[PDB]
Every structure is written in C-alpha cells, then in structure tokens.
Amino acid sequence: TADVQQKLAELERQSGGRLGVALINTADNSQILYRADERFAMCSTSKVMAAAAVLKKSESEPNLLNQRVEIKKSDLVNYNPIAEKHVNGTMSLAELSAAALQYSDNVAMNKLIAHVGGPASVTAFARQLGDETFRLDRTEPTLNTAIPGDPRDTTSPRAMAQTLRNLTLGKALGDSQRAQLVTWMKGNTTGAASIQAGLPASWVVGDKTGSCGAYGTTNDIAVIWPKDRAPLILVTYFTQPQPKAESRRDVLASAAKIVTDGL
Ligand SMILES: [Cl-]
C-alpha cells in the first residue's frame, strides 16, 4: 500500500538515516520494497553467505563440517566471543559456522571465508545462486567500514531477501544443509532487539544481525514463520550520516512492525 510506503518514509525521516527494506510474503509471492535496489553495507549479515558457501561445499565433502581448524592468537580480531575460548586448540567447521551465526564471532567468519578461498569465493558462490548484487570484498574486521557511497561489502535489500529465501526455504542447499542453516539461524542469540522486537512474541524467527560499528549501521536479515501462516523473508538495513552514530536497532523493529501489520 501507499500507506506502508508512507510509513516507511516517515520512519526513515524520523531516524535521520537511510533505510532499506525488502519483505517477501511466500503466502502470495508478493514483496514490499523500500530503497530495495540501493546498496547497503552488510556488516555481520554477510556471515550467512559465508556459512552457506561452506554448507554447499560440504554437499560433496561429507567430512567437511567435522574438519578441524586451528585457532591462534594471530587469528583474533575485534570481536571473538567464542574463538577466544579456544585459542591454541581447534574448532570444527560446524562449530565455527554456529559461532559465526549465533554469536557473530569474527574469527569464525574469517575461518569460513578462508576455507572456501576468500571473499571472491564467497562472492562467486552468491553468483552461482543467481545473486548478481552481493559482494564480499574484505575479511573481518575491515569489511565493516560502512563508508557512505562505498560499494565494498554491500548488497541490496531486494537481492538479500531473494537469496535468503533461496537459502532457507528454497533449494540453494541440499535438504540436510538447508535444515542445518535454518537451525543455526533459529538459534541466534543476538537478534531479540531487531526484527524480532517488531513482531508478535509467538512468531518464530531465524535471523542474522549486523552492526558495523561505523556510521551507526544496523542490519538484520530474517526468515519468519508467523503463527499458522506461510513464511516470510524480511531484510532491514539501516545506516546513518555520522561516522560515530549510535546503533538504531529500534528502527529495524519499527520497520518490521510496519511491513507485517495486518498479517
Ligand atoms: Cl505479542
């Protein structure tokens, strides 16, 4: 509706920043879109694509998720809540996937990236799925610079919603691997203040958040199972003009409420 568009424009104005939204309602194959073809820095939401690239690779290498990866002090970056507990030991690729998706562990992300061949390989995986917008340019932590106008480490809301639908509800991944990604995302510990905060308590959500720590950039990408309804995919990206702007997860929650009200 023009109503929902008006409400998103008003939310964006009040917030002082730039808001990107894409909702896919699988009940009727409809979309609600707001700046959905503009580029936004992904921040940690890019962890979904890295984990999915490793899952795709595991379809032809059954030992892969069990493969051990050394964690060293030289691997630590800016935020390592799980990896810091395993320094001088190993973690499996499954454990790194869960740490990246459920705790936003940046060492875990770098190990997933390295395993598949680096940022260009994560990007080539996205291209193989039919996503010609996603670009992972850098590793952690520098992928988070979020400079306005910089296309590095960005995607569009439309593209990420369509790709997340393919990954979690479609056939991008084999049945076991799809189920594994959904289980990982449903087990996220970091998303209650974002999309989930704008949805009824009963709805079931798998999501990955991302706060770059620069330009107050605050994002969330989610698969949503409303009570007794077909699932939704919702992507909400937000970034602000000031380099040291504070995070605005409430803006993502407000957008989520606007685009789902009535469902
Ligand atoms: Cl409620």
Author numbering: 27 to 289
Paper text:
CTX-M-15 (cefotaximase-Munich-15) is a class A extended-spectrum β-lactamase (ESBL) capable of hydrolyzing penicillins and cephalosporins, including third- and fourth-generation cephalosporins such as ceftazidime and cefepime, respectively. It is predominantly plasmid mediated, disseminated worldwide, and encountered in diverse Gram-negative pathogens, mostly Enterobacterales, but occasionally also in nonfermenters. CTX-M-15, like other class A SBLs, employs an acylation-deacylation mechanism to hydrolyze β-lactam antibiotics, utilizing four invariant residues: Ser70, Lys73, Ser130, and Glu166. In this study, ultrahigh-resolution X-ray crystal structures and mass spectrometry revealed the mechanism of PAS inhibition of CTX-M-15, an extended-spectrum β-lactamase (ESBL) globally disseminated among Enterobacterales.
One possible explanation for this is the presence in KPC-2 of a Cys69-Cys238 disulfide bond, a distinguishing feature of carbapenem-hydrolyzing class A enzymes. As carbapenem-hydrolyzing class A β-lactamases also contain a single amino acid insertion at position 240 (compared to the equivalent region in ESBLs such as CTX-M-15), we constructed an additional variant containing an alanine insertion at position 240 (CTX-M-15G238C/G239_Y240insA) to more closely resemble the equivalent loop in class A carbapenemases. Formation of a Cys69-Cys238 disulfide was confirmed by determining the crystal structures of both mutants. Note that the CTX-M-15G238C/G239_Y240insA loop is structurally similar to the equivalent loop in the KPC-2 carbapenemase, in which cross-link formation following PAS exposure is not observed. Neither mutant prevented cross-link formation, as evidenced by the presence of a peak corresponding to a mass loss of 18-Da on 24 h of exposure to tazobactam or enmetazobactam. Thus, presence of an active-site disulfide bond is not sufficient to abolish cross-link formation by CTX-M-15 and does not account for the absence of cross-link formation in KPC-2. As a further investigation of the importance of active-site movement to cross-link formation, we sought to constrain the CTX-M-15 active site through introduction of the equivalent disulfide by directed mutagenesis. This, however, did not affect the ability of mutant enzymes CTX-M-15G238C and CTX-M-15G238C/G239_Y240insA to form cross-links, indicating that differences in disulfide content (and possibly a concurrent reduction in active site flexibility) are not the explanation for the differing abilities of CTX-M-15 and KPC-2 to support cross-link formation.
